[PDB]
Symmetry: D2
């Protein structure tokens, strides 16, 4: 897929970021992963990000990433598949080329590792990664990699395959500046960990889509929120925030990393055994999982037969 | 007026926070102040906040505050007048009562002083201030006083005159939760230092007005942006952001406190004798004042207007 | 006394900040306060800071501050009394003059209110407060008022009554630069909320005293720690850290503001009628109070 | 060596973290690196950390790290060689084993990548890395990996080869708690980016050594500061702070990442071909190089 085609797909709907399934031994479990991705496919997200943050990119060995991407591509159907990428330049370029080779439709570039860096350095790093591949690139403003608007403009001028901007800062002042400066040169993607909490505000900032982490386990609910958002049906969005998202946030906020762990637990609850998270994430306790199960409530995909005797 | 009346006014348009004028000795300059406030009133903000943040509340002696509120009220016309209030509970209550006596239409309660406090303590502090007066109260989430939605709900249940919520945190996740919880029980006010940068986003969060600090010196431009915002004319809002506000931010960001200092410099450049800032703010350098003058450009206040 | 004399006293031992006593109605309880301050003076701190942070300065009306300073002065004996001061310049100056009039031996200038300020602005603010009185001044780096070394140097050059520097930032890098720059021009006071946690490190940075908040209710233990610190008995300092201070920190960290509220709870446990904290602080729960009582243990009065 | 031997070496002097030398194309330049490491050897730091932070660990491909370690080992003499290590567990374990294989004497474990993590998660990660090798491990409290004292105690009880603790937080309250709790179970290493600014304070906290990044280009000056520190010669420490370190900081504070870039510039000014930094660091401007040259002054290694 050429960069203008993935750019178009990014603007075509809600974004899917699947958890990466592991077996009990912590190995990638492709059979489980494909089963789950296949189910998600029925809900018609136009872009799937394999091995992104919700997919535990940050705990994968680089040689696992093309394998995960290719597994997703087996069952994605008409969905575009974007790969996570990240770390310092040398590692990032190798990952980018390796996922381009297995047929990724783009890369989502997570921060480099560890250090704070000057704008000129961010520029040089991101430029080198974009020039290493022909597929589309989305940059991700978060943590220790936060592009200013002028730096991003320079990158856009020099790197035609740079077509998306995902925000994880929550900095409205900055992201509205970026959309004012770049206009339709870029597609703007909401990227806060539970993005529906930000989506109505982010419309005003110029963002009409986002990654929905909870789409992993309540896609019907996530799809309805998104449709209501785009239709301006505020009371519908608000009901879903009050009845599902703020209660979810109360679970998510119980421990560091639960923005991922709670999503993975949700997937398990819906009958897909996505397995444990990798350290240094920790899984929800069985009690916490029961809180989430109760919250999912009417949105359950199945019924469980819990073991019981007489 | 009564709380429901200030509540209604707060939702009727763009809000103004006038700078407080000082003479050379640093004393309140009421003639200059009234002259400026009268001019601003011509641009028809339905509420002006006297002695708020932009008005250097944090540098005022408490006996100066009713004097300033009174001076505003003299020449405000129909425009409603809300007073700044703040500090610890004992001082805040004395200020609140003093400004109620000179006819304030409400109070904007800035943070208590210095310390971080538990939600239960914020609740006790704000409740006591609300209960000390009969005029309307707007709370202000910022710095060391950030109410969670459940705490704010409790306050709303027990203090009927609490009618407004101003945000200076920039925390979208929290303010959207607040508007979802409280709905029309409160009026929601955008309160970032240069709030136009946030206004289009804050609409989505449930906020349809804000304080415009730059209204102090380019009220026509501020009014033009507000009109375009409420009308959905995005290309207009964007022009004004790119041409005026991000360049203004570049000036504002040159030093701490310039969110106030640059606004006061703009007022002086437009021919209102606002005087210096009080320490620990500093005034813009002559180079910086020059930058701001050039930026005001075609919006310069002209003798022939 | 004159600024050079409060300077000397500041460097002559352990400092503390008595809690400010309130009745049930939250009004200043002078009788109780004097009873407590008199007991503390018995434990021979050379300087007590009236209406400082531990004394809830941030919740006092400006006209309450000289009343409290005066109460401490009645019973302080050989102890010098320094007054808290703060807010913006206009209020700070009024406070500074009002407590100088009731006999304050110095002022501790807490941060101004609310706003972030540029260094030139801090300089102008602090200079004006210093020049408004003849008694000595200690500046207080914390929160929204943090002086760089060069700004402080300029203040020192222009204000001879500026004689003390208290740190509440915990920024070791910055405070070592300040002591290297100023040398013996200033006395350096450790000012983290529970300062014994920092005292051994601060020695190396050039600070040999600090305010002990817990001196309020275990002055004997606080003195014991201080003596071992200056005598370089590291095993004694470490025992007291492990047995008393980290367990105290565990209680303190349960809620915002407990660096004050827990100390006030300790004072009440020692039989002084210090009363409640003022909002927006909250008092410890009964559970927490019992935790603190259990920790005070053999130090019970 | 075994972990108790590297533990002893950590307590025997100043720690050296050499910059990693690159050619103009950004590739590792082993000949220049060895020239520089050989020169440094004359100043007798007891432990050399190859591909640490100052060595741009965070910009190295994992396959570069053992080559760099082997290069250092060629010329470092009777000196303990510790390798940087980091990232998530899967990557960290492979790096750890690869540098053990080329004869590293220990690993300095930098943070995992990107995420904030719960204490039990940090525990699980660091335990797994420690158990993957037999050589000594030093943990590095900084950024998104900050161990609390109780978590660290649990790791110490379960991993006998965990023998060092390096701090990059600057949190005195915490590091003093950690030294009180663990005592001589661990060697305590100062790790703030220009550590001499912190060293006198950190003594009281229980730390008697640190990484001297500036040892890269003024090792005689760094050695004298260290000697003065351990001797209690406060006026000497202060003179060196005022005349050299605060001026160095003024240069260092001009841009993000200059804690590394300025050190590398200093090495180039002393006549070693250390080359450019890798993005996303940037090199000092010509003006800035000039400021640093002037500062080095009497300490120049050559004309």
């Amino acid at each position: 897929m050429d960069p203008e085609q993935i750019k178009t797909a990014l603007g075509s709907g809600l974004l899917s970021f699947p958890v990466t399934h592991f077996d009990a031994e912590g190995r990638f479990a492709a059979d489980s992963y494909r089963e789950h991705v296949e189910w998600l496919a029925g809900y018609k997200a136009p872009v799937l990000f394999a091995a992104g943050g919700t997919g535990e990119f940050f705990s994968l060995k680089p040689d696992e990433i093309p394998t995960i991407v290719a597994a997703a591509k087996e069952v994605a159907g008409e969905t575009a598949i974007v790969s996570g990428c990240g770390y310092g330049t040398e590692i990032a370029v190798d990952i980018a080329r390796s996922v381009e080779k297995v047929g990724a439709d783009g890369i989502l570039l997570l921060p480099h590792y560890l250090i704070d860096a000057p704008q000129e350095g961010l520029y040089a790093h991101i430029k080198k990664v974009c020039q290493s591949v022909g597929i589309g690139v989305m940059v991700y403003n978060r943590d220790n990699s936060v592009l200013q608007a002028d730096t991003l403009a320079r990158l856009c001028d020099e790197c035609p395959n740079l077509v998306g901007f995902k925000d994880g800062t929550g900095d409205i002042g900055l992201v509205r500046q970026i959309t004012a400066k770049m206009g339709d040169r870029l597609m703007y993607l909401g990227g806060m960990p539970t993005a529906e909490l930000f989506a109505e505000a982010y419309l005003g900032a110029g963002f009409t889509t986002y990654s929905s982490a909870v789409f992993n386990f309540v896609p019907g609910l996530a799809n309805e929120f998104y449709a209501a958002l785009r239709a301006g049906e505020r009371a519908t969005c608000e009901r879903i925030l009050v009845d599902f998202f703020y209660p979810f946030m109360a679970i998510r906020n119980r421990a560091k990393g639960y923005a991922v762990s709670a999503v993975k637990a949700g997937v398990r609850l819906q009958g897909f055994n996505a397995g444990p998270v990798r350290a240094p994430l920790k899984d929800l306790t069985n009690e916490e999982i029961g809180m989430l199960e109760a919250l999912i409530g009417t949105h359950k995909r199945k019924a469980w037969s819990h073991p019981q005797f007489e």
